[PDB]
Design a protein around this nucleic acid. Structure first.
Ligand SMILES: [Mg+2]
Ligand SMILES: [Mg+2]
Length: 163
RNA sequence: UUUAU
């Protein structure tokens, strides 16, 4: 938009699960979230999902949305593997906070990241000021005008760098 | 830490 927009880091698992009412990994919800930011002019957007969310064996709903996002250079995969029928995953939350640190971006998630805030002042601060929670109503993605509450910034300010 | 609260 104005080249002062922040990078958007999306917790894909969290978004998909909310869209799927904590039952389905609903890929459509991730595409809807991306479209929301895209429509505001954001062009720096990264969705993290685990490697398993492309595995043939895994139950993911409407997985072709993930393929669309991958091909648009919007999707990155966090490591996971099955050893002795035991799935081991790298903790995806660390990638999100790290990327947010690298980019001065915000994280779209209803996760609170309590465990990672405790780990440094840089990270503690990202988690206090750069976390953007969200709601779905069916296929309508809704984000608060007041992401940090009544005395915090507006959404518009929140999604920009002081330029 | 097979996504959260
Ligand atoms: Mg997570
Ligand atoms: Mg977490």
């Amino acid at each position: 938009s104005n080249a002062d927009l922040r990078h958007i880091v999306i917790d894909g698992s969290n978004v998909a699960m909310v869209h799927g009412l904590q039952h389905y990994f609903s890929s459509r919800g991730i595409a809807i979230a991306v479209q929301y930011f895209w429509d505001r002019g954001h062009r720096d957007i990264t969705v993290f999902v685990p490697q398993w969310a492309f595995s043939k064996d895994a139950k993911v709903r409407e997985s072709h949305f993930l393929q669309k996002l991958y091909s648009l250079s919007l999707l990155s995969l966090t490591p996971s593997r099955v050893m002795d029928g035991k799935r081991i995953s790298s903790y995806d939350d660390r990638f999100m906070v790290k990327l947010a640190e690298e980019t001065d971006g915000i994280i779209v998630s209803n996760d609170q990241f309590r465990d990672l805030a405790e780990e440094s002042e840089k990270w503690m601060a990202i988690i206090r000021e750069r976390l953007l929670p969200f709601t779905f109503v069916g296929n309508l993605f809704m984000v608060p005008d007041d992401p940090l509450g009544r005395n915090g910034p507006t959404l518009d300010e929140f999604l920009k760098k002081p330029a």
